[PDB]
Short mmCIF file of C-alpha atoms (C1' of nucleotides) and ligand atoms in Angstrom, two decimals:
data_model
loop_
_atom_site.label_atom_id
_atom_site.label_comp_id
_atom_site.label_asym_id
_atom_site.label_seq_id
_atom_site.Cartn_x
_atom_site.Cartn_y
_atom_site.Cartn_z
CA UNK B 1 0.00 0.00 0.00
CA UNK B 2 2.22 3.28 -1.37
CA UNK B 3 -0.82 6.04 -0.94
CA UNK B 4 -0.74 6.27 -4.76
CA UNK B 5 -4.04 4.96 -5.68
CA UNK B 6 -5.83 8.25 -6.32
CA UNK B 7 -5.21 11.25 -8.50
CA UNK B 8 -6.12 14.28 -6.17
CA UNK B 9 -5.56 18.42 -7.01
CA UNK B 10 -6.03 21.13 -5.09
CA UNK B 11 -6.74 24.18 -6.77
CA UNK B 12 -6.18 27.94 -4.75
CA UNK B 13 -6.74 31.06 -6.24
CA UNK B 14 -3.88 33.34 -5.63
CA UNK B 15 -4.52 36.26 -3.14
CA UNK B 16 -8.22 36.00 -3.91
CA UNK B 17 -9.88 38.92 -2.48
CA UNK B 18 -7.05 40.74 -3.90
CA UNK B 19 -8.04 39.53 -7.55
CA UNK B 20 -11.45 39.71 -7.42
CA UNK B 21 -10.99 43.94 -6.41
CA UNK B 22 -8.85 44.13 -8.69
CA UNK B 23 -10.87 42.59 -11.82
CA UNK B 24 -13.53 44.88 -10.59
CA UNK B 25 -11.56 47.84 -10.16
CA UNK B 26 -8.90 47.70 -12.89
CA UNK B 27 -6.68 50.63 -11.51
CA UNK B 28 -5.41 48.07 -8.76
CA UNK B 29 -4.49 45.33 -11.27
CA UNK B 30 -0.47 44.71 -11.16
CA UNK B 31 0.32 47.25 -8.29
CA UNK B 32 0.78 46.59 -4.61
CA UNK B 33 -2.51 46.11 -3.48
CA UNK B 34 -3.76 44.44 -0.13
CA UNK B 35 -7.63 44.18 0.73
CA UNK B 36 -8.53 45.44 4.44
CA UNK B 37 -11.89 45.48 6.87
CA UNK B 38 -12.77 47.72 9.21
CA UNK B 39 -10.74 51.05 7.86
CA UNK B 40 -11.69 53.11 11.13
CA UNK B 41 -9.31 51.13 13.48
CA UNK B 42 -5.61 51.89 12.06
CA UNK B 43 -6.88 51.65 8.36
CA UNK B 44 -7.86 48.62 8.68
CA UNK B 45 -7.14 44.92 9.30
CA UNK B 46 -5.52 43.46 5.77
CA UNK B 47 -6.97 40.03 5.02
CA UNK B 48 -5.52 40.00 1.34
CA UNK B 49 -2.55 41.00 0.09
CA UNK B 50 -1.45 40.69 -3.67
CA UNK B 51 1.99 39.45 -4.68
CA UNK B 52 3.58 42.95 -5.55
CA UNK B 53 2.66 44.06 -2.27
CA UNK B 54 4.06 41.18 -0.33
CA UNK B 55 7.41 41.67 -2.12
CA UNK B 56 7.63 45.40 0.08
CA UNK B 57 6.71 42.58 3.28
CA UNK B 58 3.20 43.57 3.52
CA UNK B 59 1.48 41.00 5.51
CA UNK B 60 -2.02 39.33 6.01
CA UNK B 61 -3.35 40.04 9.59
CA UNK B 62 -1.72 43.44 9.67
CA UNK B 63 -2.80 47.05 9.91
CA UNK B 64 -3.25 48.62 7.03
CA UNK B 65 -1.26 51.90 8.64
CA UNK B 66 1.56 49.57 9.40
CA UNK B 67 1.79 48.21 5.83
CA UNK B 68 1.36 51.83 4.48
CA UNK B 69 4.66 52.41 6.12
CA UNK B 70 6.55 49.42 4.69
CA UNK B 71 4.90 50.28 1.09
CA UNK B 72 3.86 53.62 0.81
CA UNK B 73 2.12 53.21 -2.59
CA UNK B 74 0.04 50.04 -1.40
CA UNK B 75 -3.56 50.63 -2.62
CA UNK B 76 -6.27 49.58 -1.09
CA UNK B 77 -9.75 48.26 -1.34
CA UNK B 78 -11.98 47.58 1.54
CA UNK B 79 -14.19 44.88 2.22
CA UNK B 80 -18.11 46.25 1.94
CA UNK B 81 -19.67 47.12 4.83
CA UNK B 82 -23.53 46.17 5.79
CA UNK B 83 -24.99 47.12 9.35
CA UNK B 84 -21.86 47.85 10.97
CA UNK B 85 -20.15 44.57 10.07
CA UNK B 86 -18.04 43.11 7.01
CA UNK B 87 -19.67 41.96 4.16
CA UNK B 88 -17.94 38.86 2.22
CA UNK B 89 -20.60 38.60 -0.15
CA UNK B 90 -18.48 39.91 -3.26
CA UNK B 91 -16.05 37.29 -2.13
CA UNK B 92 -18.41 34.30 -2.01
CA UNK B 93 -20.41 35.08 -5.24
CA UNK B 94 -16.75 35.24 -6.99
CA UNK B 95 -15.91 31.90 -4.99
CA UNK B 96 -19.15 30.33 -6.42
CA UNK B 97 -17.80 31.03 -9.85
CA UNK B 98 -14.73 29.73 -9.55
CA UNK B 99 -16.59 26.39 -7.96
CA UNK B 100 -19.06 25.98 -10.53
CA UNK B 101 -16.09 26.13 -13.36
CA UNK B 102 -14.31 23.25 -11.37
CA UNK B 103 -17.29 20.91 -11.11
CA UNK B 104 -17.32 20.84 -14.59
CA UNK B 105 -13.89 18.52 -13.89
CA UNK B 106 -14.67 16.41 -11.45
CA UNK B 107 -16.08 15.99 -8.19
CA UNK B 108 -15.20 18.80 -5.64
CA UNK B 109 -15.14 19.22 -2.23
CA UNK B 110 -14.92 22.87 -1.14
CA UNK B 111 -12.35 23.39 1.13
CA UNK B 112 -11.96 27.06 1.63
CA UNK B 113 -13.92 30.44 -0.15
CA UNK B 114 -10.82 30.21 -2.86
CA UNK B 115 -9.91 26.48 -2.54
CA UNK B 116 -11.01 23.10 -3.67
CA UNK B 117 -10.23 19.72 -3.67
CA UNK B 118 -11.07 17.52 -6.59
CA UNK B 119 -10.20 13.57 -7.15
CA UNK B 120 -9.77 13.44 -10.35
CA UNK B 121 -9.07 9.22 -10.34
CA UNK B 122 -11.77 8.72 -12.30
CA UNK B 123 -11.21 11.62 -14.95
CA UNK B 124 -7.74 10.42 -15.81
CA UNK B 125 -8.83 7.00 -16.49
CA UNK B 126 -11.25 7.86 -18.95
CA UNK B 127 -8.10 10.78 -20.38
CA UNK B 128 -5.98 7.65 -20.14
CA UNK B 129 -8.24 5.97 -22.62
CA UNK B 130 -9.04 8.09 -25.14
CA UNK B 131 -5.23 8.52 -26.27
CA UNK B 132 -3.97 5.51 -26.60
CA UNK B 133 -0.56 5.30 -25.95
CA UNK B 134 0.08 9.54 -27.27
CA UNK B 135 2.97 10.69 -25.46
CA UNK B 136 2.15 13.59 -22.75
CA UNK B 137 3.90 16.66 -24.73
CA UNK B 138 5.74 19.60 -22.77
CA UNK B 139 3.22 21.41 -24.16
CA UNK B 140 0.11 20.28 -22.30
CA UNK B 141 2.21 21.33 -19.29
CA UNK B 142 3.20 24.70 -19.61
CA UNK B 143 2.54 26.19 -15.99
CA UNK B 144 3.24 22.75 -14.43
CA UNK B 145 6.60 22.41 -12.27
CA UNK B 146 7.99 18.76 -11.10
CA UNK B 147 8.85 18.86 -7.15
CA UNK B 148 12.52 17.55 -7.05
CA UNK B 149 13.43 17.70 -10.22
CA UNK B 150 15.64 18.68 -12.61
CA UNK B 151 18.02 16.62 -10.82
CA UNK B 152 21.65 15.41 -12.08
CA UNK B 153 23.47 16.98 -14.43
CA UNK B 154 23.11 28.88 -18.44
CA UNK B 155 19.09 27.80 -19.07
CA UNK B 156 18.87 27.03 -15.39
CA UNK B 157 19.83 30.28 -14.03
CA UNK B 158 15.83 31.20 -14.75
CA UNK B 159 12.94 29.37 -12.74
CA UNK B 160 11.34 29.04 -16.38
CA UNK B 161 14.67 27.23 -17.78
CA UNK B 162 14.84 25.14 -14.55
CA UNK B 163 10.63 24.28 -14.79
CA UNK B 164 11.43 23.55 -18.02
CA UNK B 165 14.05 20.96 -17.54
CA UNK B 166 12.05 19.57 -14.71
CA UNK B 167 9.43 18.78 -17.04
CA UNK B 168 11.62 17.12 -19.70
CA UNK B 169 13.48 14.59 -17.12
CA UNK B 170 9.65 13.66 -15.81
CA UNK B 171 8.38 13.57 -19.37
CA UNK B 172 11.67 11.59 -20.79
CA UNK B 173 11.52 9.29 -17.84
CA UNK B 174 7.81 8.89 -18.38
CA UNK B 175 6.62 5.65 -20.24
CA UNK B 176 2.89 5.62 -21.76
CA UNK B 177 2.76 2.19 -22.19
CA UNK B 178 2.17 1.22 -18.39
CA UNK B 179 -1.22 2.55 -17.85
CA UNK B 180 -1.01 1.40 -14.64
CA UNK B 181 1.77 3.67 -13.32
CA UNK B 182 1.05 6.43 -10.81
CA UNK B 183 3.10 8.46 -12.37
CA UNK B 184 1.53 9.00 -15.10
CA UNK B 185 -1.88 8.86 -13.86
CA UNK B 186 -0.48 11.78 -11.44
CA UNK B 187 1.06 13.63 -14.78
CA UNK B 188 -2.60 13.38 -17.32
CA UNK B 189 -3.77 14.78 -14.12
CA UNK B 190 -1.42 17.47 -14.10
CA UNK B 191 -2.79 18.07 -17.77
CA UNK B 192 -6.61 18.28 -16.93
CA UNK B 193 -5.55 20.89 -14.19
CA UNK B 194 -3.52 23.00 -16.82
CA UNK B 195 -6.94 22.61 -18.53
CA UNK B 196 -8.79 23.47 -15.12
CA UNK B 197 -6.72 26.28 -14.46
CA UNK B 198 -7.34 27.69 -17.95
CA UNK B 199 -11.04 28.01 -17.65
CA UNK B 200 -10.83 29.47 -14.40
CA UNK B 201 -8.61 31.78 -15.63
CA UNK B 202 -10.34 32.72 -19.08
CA UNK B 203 -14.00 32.54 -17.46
CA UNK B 204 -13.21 34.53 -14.65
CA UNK B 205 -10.14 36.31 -15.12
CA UNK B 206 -8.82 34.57 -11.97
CA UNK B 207 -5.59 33.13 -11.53
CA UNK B 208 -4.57 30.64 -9.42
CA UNK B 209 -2.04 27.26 -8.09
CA UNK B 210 -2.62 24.04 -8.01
CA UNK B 211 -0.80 20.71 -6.44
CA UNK B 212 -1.11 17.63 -8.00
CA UNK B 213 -0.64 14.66 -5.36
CA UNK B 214 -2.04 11.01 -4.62
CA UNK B 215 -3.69 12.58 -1.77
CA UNK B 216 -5.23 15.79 0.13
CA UNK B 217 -2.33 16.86 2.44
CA UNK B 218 0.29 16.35 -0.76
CA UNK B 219 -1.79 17.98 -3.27
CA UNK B 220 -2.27 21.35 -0.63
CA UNK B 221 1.56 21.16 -0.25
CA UNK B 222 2.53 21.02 -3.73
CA UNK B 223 -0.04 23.85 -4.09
CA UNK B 224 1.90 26.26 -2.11
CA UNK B 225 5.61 24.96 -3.61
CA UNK B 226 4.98 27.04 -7.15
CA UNK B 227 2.29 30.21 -6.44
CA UNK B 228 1.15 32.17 -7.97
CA UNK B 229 -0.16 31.39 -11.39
CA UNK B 230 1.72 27.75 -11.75
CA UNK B 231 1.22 24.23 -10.38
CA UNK B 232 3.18 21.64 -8.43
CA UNK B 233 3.18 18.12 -9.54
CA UNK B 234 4.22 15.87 -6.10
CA UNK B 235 4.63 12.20 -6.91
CA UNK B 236 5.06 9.34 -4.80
CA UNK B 237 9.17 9.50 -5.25
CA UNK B 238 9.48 13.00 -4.53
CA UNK B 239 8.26 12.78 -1.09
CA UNK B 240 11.54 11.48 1.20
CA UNK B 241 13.69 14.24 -0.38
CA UNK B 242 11.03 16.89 0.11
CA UNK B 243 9.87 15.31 4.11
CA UNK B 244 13.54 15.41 5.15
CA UNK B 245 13.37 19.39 5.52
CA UNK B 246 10.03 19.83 5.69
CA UNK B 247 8.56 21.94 8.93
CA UNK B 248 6.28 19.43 10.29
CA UNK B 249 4.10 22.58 10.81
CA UNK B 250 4.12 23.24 7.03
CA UNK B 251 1.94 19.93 6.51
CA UNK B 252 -1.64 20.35 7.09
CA UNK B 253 -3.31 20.09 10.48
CA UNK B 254 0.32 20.34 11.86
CA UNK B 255 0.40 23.87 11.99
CA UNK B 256 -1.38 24.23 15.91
CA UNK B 257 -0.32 22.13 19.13
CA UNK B 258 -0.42 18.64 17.71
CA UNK B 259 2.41 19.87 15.58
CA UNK B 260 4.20 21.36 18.41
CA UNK B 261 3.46 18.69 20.63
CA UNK B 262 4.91 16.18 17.77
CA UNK B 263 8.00 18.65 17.56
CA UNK B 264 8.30 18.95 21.30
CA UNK B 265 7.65 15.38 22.35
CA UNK B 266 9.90 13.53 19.61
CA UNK B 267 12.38 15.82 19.20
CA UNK B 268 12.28 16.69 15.62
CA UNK B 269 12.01 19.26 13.83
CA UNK B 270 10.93 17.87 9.65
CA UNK B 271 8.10 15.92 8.37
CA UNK B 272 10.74 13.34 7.26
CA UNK B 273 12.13 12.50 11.01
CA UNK B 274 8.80 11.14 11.61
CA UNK B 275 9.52 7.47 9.75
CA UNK B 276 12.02 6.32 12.47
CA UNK B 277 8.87 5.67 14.88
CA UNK B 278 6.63 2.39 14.29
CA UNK B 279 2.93 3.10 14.03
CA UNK B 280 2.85 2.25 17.97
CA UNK B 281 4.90 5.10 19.37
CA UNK B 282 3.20 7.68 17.35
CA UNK B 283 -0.02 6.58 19.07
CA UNK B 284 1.16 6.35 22.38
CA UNK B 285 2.14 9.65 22.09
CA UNK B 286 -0.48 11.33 20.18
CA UNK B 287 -3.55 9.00 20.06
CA UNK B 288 -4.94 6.53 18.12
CA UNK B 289 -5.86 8.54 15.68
CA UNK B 290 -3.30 11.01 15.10
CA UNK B 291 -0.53 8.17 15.54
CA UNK B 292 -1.72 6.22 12.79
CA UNK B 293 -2.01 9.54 10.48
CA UNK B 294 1.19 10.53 11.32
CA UNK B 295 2.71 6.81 10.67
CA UNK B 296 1.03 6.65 7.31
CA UNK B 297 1.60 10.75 6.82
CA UNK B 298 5.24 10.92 7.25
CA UNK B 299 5.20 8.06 4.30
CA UNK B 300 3.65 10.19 2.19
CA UNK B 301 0.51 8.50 2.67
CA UNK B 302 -2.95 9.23 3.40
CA UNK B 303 -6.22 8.46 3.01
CA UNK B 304 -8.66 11.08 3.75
CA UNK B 305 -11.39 10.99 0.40
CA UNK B 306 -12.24 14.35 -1.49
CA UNK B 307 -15.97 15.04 -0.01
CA UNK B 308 -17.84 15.37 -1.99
CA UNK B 309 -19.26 19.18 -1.03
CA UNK B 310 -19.80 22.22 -2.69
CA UNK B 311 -21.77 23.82 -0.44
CA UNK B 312 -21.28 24.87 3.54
CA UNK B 313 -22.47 22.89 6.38
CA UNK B 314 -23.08 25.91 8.33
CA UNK B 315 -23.58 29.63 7.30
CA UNK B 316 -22.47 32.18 9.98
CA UNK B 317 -22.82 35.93 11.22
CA UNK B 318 -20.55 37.19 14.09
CA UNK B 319 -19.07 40.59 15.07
CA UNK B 320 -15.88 41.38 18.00
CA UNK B 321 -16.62 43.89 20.42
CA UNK B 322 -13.17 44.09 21.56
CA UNK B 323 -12.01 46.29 24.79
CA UNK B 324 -13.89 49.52 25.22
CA UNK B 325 -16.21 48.78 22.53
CA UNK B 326 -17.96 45.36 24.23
CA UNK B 327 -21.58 46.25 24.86
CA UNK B 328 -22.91 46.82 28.54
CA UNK B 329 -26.72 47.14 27.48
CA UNK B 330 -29.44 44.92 26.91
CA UNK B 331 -30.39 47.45 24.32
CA UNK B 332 -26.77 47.34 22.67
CA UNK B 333 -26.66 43.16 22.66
CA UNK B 334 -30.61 43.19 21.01
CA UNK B 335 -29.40 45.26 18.14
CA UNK B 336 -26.51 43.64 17.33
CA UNK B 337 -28.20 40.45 17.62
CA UNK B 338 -30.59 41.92 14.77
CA UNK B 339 -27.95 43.04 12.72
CA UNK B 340 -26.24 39.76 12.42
CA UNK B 341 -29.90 38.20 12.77
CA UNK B 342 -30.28 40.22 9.09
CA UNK B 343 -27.48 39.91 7.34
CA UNK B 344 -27.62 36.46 8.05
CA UNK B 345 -31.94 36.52 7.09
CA UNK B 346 -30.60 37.52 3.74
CA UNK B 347 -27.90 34.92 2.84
CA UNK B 348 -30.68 32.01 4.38
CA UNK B 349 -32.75 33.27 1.77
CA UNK B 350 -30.35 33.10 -0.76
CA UNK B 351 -29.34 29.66 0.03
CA UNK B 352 -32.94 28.59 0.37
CA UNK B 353 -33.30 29.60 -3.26
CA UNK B 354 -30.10 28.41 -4.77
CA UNK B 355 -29.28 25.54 -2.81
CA UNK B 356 -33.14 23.85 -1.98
CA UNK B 357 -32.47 23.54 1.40
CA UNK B 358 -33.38 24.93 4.89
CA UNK B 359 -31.77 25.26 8.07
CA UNK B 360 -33.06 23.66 10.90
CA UNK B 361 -31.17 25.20 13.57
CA UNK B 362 -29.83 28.38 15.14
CA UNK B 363 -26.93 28.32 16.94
CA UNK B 364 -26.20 31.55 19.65
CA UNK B 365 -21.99 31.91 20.87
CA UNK B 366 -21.17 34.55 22.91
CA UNK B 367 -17.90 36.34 24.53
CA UNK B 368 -17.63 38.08 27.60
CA UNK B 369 -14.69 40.48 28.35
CA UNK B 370 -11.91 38.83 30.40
CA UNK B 371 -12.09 35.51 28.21
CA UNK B 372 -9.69 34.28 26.12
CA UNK B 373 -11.23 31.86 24.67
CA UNK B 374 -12.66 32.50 21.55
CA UNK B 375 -15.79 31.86 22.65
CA UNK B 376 -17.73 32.31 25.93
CA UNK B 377 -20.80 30.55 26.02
CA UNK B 378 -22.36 28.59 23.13
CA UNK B 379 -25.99 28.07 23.20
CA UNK B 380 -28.83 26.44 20.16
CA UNK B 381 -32.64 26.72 19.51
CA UNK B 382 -34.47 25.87 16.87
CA UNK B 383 -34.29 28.09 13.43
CA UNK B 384 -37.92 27.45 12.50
CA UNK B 385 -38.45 30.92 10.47
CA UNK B 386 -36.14 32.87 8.08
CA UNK B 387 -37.37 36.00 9.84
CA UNK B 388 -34.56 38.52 11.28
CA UNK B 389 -36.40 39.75 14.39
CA UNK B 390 -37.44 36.07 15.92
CA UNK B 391 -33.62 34.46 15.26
CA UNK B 392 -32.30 37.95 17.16
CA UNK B 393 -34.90 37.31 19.67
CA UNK B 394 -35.08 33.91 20.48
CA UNK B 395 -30.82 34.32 20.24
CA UNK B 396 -31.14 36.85 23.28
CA UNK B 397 -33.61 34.56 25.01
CA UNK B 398 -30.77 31.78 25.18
CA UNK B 399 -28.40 33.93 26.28
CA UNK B 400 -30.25 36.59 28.74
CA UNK B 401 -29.08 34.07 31.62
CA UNK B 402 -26.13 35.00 31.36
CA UNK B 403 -26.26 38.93 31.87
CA UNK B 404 -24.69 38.80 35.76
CA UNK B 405 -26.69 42.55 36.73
CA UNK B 406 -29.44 42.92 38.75
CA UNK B 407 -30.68 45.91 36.96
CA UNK B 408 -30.89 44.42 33.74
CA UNK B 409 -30.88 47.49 31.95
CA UNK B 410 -27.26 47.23 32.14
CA UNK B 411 -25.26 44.20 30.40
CA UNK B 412 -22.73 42.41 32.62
CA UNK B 413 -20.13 41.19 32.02
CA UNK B 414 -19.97 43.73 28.28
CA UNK B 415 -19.83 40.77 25.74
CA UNK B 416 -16.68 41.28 23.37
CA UNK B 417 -18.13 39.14 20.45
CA UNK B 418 -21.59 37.74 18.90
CA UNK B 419 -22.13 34.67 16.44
CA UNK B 420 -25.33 33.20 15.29
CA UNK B 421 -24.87 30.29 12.98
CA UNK B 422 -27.23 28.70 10.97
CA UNK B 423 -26.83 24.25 11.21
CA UNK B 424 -28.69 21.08 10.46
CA UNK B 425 -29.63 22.24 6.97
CA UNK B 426 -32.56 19.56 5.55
CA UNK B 427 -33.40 19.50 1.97
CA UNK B 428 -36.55 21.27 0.47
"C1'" DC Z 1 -8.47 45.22 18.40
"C1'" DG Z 2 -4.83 40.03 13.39
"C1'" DG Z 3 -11.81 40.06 12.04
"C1'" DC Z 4 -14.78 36.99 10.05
"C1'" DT Z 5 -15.67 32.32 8.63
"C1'" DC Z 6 -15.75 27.48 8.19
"C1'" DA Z 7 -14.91 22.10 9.29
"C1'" DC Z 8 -14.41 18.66 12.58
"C1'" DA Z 9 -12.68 15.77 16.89
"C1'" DC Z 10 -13.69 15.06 21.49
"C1'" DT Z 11 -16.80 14.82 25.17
"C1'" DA I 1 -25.58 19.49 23.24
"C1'" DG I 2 -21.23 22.07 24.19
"C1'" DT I 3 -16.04 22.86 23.89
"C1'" DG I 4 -11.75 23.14 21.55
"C1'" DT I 5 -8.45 22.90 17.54
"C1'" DG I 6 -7.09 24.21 12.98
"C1'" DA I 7 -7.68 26.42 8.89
"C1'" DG I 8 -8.22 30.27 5.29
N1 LIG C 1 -6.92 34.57 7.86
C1 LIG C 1 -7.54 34.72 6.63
C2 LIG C 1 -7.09 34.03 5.52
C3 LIG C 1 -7.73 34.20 4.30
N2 LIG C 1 -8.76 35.04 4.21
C4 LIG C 1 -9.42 35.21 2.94
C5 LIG C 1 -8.66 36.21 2.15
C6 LIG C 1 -7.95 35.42 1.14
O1 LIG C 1 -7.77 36.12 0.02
C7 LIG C 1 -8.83 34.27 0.90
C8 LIG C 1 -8.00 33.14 0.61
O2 LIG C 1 -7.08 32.79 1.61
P1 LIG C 1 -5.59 32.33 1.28
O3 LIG C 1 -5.63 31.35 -0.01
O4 LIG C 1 -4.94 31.47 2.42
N3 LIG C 1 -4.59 33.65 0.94
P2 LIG C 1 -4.75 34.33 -0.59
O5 LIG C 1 -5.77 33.69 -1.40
O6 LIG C 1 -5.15 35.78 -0.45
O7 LIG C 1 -3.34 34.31 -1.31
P3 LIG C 1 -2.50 33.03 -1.67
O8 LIG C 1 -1.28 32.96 -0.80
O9 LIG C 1 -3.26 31.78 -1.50
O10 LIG C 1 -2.07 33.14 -3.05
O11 LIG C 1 -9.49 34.02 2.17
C9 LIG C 1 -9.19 35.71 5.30
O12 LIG C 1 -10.09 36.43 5.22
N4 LIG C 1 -8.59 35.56 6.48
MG1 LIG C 2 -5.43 31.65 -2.13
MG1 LIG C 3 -6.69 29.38 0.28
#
DNA sequence: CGGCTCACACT
DNA sequence: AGTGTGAG
């Protein structure tokens, strides 16, 4: 069992809320240009940033003040703004076109607003097929790199020479005949993302990466090898040379205390490192679970399936109240309640509509200051009606309890942060 | 005051 | 049903 049974890509668009201001508003197309929310509080918090911009060091997660000083010419374009909260709907509408284009392919499962998985097994067998035998030209490949390669022995000295030369030794070494092969299975792949990326690109005007792997965690990580604008082929073979100085807290699910914990605990620092332990130790130390992923992980195998999901389980609402700001009123906590209750009334709607489904329940999380935990309290009722003013009512009746004053007029303690989620979506 | 948004494991 | 982790 080598892992290389499926064909798996996954497909990110390249600094996504970035792009899709920028096709909108053309002035910001091939400048330094980061997207930021909330432009009151030191310009703003920058979610996006595009790739001239983070050559000056501008950052995701950073004020937009702070990255003015680091690139004074950094334009910017700010998330819309609905009832005193951020509005992603731009964002998700130009996700759902990017989605749509990709299910064309194959299968998806949606793992992000600008990411998808998609096996695409079953696509290169039938691609397989239909040329019998035809060698896999260079040109079918032309943003495709080959992790680890060239190898061996002046074109070089450019990544397009060196991508290039890559690409021959995998396509020389390549042999049609065997069908079979994961390989080339992995490589016709490579060719229907090329094709993927293409009509994401020309129907959108979009561009993204992609990583081509036998599985989820592989594909993401070859993904991120090549942006923006190319993709990473990651076979089977490449995988020992590329583990052995590999963060383990590059590889997905590794980047929070498990990975730390694995780091800590085994005294390791790369992905590779993690072979020398039988299947045993890796659970005794991390679980059942986790052991057995690692085991099979560090091998460069795994096993978790593409879902097959376009759509989210759960559509949510929430706003911070951070420091001063966190609301002491029962007055202050209704409207804000209604506001989310609102915003999320109108994307319900929407999903009712497009999607032919309804959600069955209403979920209420709140924080109050002095936590750090993200959240408080979290509290359900039922989501019966799409109707603003009950969800933001029956949301404050599961969480009234919790108001500590006796005059009740007053809110204590002032929550910093309110989420309603809709969940348990039923078809209709 | 890195904000808002998801998915999922564990209990 | 609720809490926590991890991610994008
Ligand atoms: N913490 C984060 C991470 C991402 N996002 C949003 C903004 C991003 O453009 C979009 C996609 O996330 P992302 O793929 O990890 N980074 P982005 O697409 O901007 O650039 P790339 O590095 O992938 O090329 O989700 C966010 O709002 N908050
Ligand atoms: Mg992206
Ligand atoms: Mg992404």
């Amino acid at each position: 069992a080598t892992g290389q049974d499926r064909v798996v890509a996954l497909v990110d668009m390249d600094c996504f809320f970035v792009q899709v201001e920028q096709r909108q508003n053309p002035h910001l197309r091939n400048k330094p240009c980061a997207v930021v929310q909330y432009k009151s509080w030191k310009g703003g918090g920058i979610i996006a940033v595009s790739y001239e911009a983070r050559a000056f060091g501008v950052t995701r997660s950073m004020w937009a003040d702070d990255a003015k000083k680091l690139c004074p010419d950094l334009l910017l374009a700010q998330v819309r703004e609905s009832r005193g909260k951020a509005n992603l709907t731009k964002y998700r509408e130009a996700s759902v076109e990017v989605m749509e284009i990709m299910s064309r392919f194959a299968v998806i499962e949606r793992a992000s607003i600008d990411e998808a998985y998609v096996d695409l097994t079953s696509a290169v067998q039938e691609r397989l097929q239909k040329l019998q035998g035809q060698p896999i030209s260079a040109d079918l490949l032309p943003s495709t790199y080959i992790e680890g390669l060239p190898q061996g022995p002046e074109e070089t000295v450019q990544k397009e020479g060196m991508r290039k030369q890559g690409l021959f030794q995998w396509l020389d070494s390549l042999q049609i005949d065997n069908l079979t092969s994961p390989d080339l299975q992995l490589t016709v792949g490579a060719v229907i993302v090329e094709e993927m990326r293409a009509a994401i690109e020309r129907e959108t005007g979009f561009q993204c990466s992609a990583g081509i792997s036998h599985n989820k965690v592989l594909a993401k990580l070859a993904c991120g090898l090549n942006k923006p604008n190319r993709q990473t082929l990651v076979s089977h073979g490449s995988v020992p040379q590329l583990f052995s100085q590999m963060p383990i807290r590059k590889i997905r699910s590794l980047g929070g205390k498990l990975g730390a914990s694995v780091i800590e605990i085994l005294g390791i620092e790369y992905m590779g490192e993690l072979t020398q332990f039988t299947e045993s130790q890796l659970q005794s130390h991390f679980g059942e679970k986790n052991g057995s992923w690692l085991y099979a992980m560090c091998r460069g195998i795994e096993h978790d399936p593409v879902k097959p999901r376009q759509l989210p389980k759960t559509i949510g609402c929430s706003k911070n109240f951070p420091g001063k700001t966190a609301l002491a009123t029962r007055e202050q906590v209704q409207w804000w309640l209604l506001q989310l209750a609102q915003e999320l009334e109108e994307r319900l709607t929407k999903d009712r509509n497009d999607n032919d489904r309804v959600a069955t329940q209403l979920v209420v999380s709140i924080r109050v200051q002095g936590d750090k935990r993200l959240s408080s309290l979290r509290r359900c009722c039922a989501l019966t009606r799409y109707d603003a003013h009950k969800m933001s009512h029956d949301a404050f009746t599961v969480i009234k309890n919790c108001n500590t004053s006796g005059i009740q007029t007053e809110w204590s303690p002032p929550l910093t942060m309110l989420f309603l989620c809709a969940t348990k979506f039923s078809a209709s």
